[PDB]
Design a protein around this ligand. Sequence first.
Ligand SMILES: Nc1ncnc2c1ncn2[C@@H]1O[C@H](COP(=O)(O)O)[C@@H](O)[C@H]1O
Ligand SMILES: Nc1ncnc2c1ncn2[C@@H]1O[C@H](COP(=O)(O)O)[C@@H](O)[C@H]1O
Ligand SMILES: [Mg+2]
Ligand SMILES: [Mg+2]
Lengths: 419, 419
Amino acid sequence: MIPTEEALRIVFGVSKRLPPVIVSLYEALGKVLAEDIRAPDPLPPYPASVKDGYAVVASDGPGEYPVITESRAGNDGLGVTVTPGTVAYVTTGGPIPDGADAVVQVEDTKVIGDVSKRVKILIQTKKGTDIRRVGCDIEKDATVLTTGERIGASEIGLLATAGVTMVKVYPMPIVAILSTGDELVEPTAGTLGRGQIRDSNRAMLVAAVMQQQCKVVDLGIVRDDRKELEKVLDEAVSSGVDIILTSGGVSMGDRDFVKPLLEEKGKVYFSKVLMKPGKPLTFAEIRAKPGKTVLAFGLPGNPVSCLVCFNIFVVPTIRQLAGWTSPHPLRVRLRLQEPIKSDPIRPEFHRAIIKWKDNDGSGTPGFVAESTGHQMSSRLLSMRSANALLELPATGNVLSAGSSVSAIIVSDISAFSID
Amino acid sequence: MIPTEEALRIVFGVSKRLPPVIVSLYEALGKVLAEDIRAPDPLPPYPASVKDGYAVVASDGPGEYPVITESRAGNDGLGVTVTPGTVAYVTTGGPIPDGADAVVQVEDTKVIGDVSKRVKILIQTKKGTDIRRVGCDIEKDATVLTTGERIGASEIGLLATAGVTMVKVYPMPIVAILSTGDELVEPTAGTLGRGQIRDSNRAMLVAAVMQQQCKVVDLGIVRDDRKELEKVLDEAVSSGVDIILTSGGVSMGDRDFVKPLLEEKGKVYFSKVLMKPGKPLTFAEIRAKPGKTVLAFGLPGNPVSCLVCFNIFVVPTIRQLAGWTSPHPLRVRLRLQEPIKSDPIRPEFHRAIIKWKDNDGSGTPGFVAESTGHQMSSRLLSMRSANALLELPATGNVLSAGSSVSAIIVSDISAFSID
Ligand SMILES: Nc1ncnc2c1ncn2[C@@H]1O[C@H](COP(=O)(O)O)[C@@H](O)[C@H]1O
Ligand SMILES: Nc1ncnc2c1ncn2[C@@H]1O[C@H](COP(=O)(O)O)[C@@H](O)[C@H]1O
Ligand SMILES: [Mg+2]
Ligand SMILES: [Mg+2]
């Protein structure tokens, strides 16, 4: 039985970034860049107006002037030179005609006469005012995005700015998922027969893997039969998946074949972890016959233990395979809203609902946590709405309301409900 | 020009939750429940063993006993009564045979003899030990999920537990997106002609809407021509989309037709907001001809202003339409890692890279922020890697390193890179 910190280091040490691939612009969203991106031309590529108004010769100053051209886009004002004593109309983003050295926003001007166009400039401007010089936002050949950078909406915007529609990225791993048990029935079952339960771990894990943006290979329910589970595992290993997730069949039962099958097919690094919940977790590395490595997680059958182990061990493995340089989950410090008793032997991953408060109880703003209630590993209602796992050390003491603890954030911090 | 707080209240007051729909189990992931979910049967539906070991009569105590049945699943041990002086083998999740009232884990037992099976129970157990009574995890008819609850992986697990494979939920809005400008070219363009730039806002907004899990209707580049933009807007309004996003054509240019077109087609609630960046934001409500409401956001053309306005105003509108009871973004308090000058007139949404530190500079743990650098609204590099918007009040003063500010979190808090 190894500590969770060691089990994580073993998984990190075995897990390898996947080979990069080439994808289209919208397929690159959410993925990590596997190349640097350089601007092929400057932004703006021409001197551009910051305002709707008039391009002027700054030294002219306030006065009345004829409007010799209008410049909004493309070839507008091409070949026209704004000389001292003239002005040109411009819209925001319009090219500055040759000879103009500043822009006076339309609010500081007045159109004069009926009908030839004339405008009154109401202020003294300064050279360079309200003009974006060539390359002031992005210089030609500047690196706008680098290898190891995760692509979000602004990074998609920068790729589009630089004219990149095919991107080299690290792909997401493909994950096979199966459930084990003679007691299981499909979640479509109505009236349950004696000694049956609906398979809940498979759909829970499919959903968890969908939230990590990975393709899922759903291998269904497997019975407690060694030859049957070996056949499904051999089929999962040779299919091309990168990760295999099983649940159940990893305790002390006489028909728990997951561990001995992973020992035959590959190398089991560990089968027991000092943690509450999640003790019987198995981690193995299998080589598929030519050829590639396949990571196998023998997750515990208990629904809570299953999802806690997914959140702590499988999420960083997916991220590592997908080329994330920082795969660890966000850990914050927070105050307890109620007392919680820690375990005397195993450090606990106590499920909680956390929120940011203007006053965390200590007079300063901070995160606070409420327990989800009874933490029994068979009680999936303890995972309901839990956005964090409180890391309670193995002291056996009652942590009173107001005490501070470390918490792992397991669900979108930007989707956190406010206080 | 209205404050951002008022502009948000107007948007919230106009935005209505979409009618609920019925979807399959995996389609419900990420969506808000539009009905309560009750367990049709208990969990466990039979008294179940917590351990691999033996089901016993607690009062018998330590001793040697014959193993009269084996119970792992289904009908195993049906009709067999464990009487005083006998035991039954059980696996975790196996039904407890009639007459047995406790379970002794296999580690507290020893198999005796060769070959009839006999086992030695090494301890004195207590009635009810290591047995999950019927309904101890979930009672029959208990509400396991309620209306207004967002569905994550554990909620998918609870739906599967309760045998629900078709779910009533609030759908996501469908969003139409177009760009405006005679200066724009597609992001596939190579060498740019004079006065041209690649359309970056459209792909940026498509990506931003994809991260919000909404269907996108890509309406392309529209030129600065009133009749052309009216035709595309009329086509967007009658297509069935719930939200229309335009960018550009909302400043003071003589060919900026977005505002007057939204005034003709519907009701414009505002066209100017007191903020840095994002001043020319237009918000309108259009009624499609029978019939339904369509929300239109005339986003600013400047790439930074475009994305900042999306993050502040469009994200909560999407969430409100999708039935989120808490659509507001997460706001935290944090310390500045460097000095920042605030604007004397407009409150600024200064882009930053934030992280949780064990020491935020004050001796206690907390979030800290680094600026992304020059904040010019034309500089999309200021959005690069920004996971927060610092809310800087309009004081004109230099906020020194170490001072505390409010920050809006704009990207997955569970995807935050650690310190
Ligand atoms: N797919 C599943 N869905 C729900 N419960 C499960 C699943 N697989 C295993 N379990 C339960 O988890 C516990 C441990 O499983 P095992 O390790 O196979 O003994 C038992 O109570 C099982 O009935
Ligand atoms: N789709 C777009 N992509 C990049 N820049 C844009 C886009 N639309 C408008 N702009 C720029 O944003 C600024 C304001 O646009 P407008 O409001 O149309 O004058 C100008 O500098 C435009 O060239
Ligand atoms: Mg089992
Ligand atoms: Mg324009």
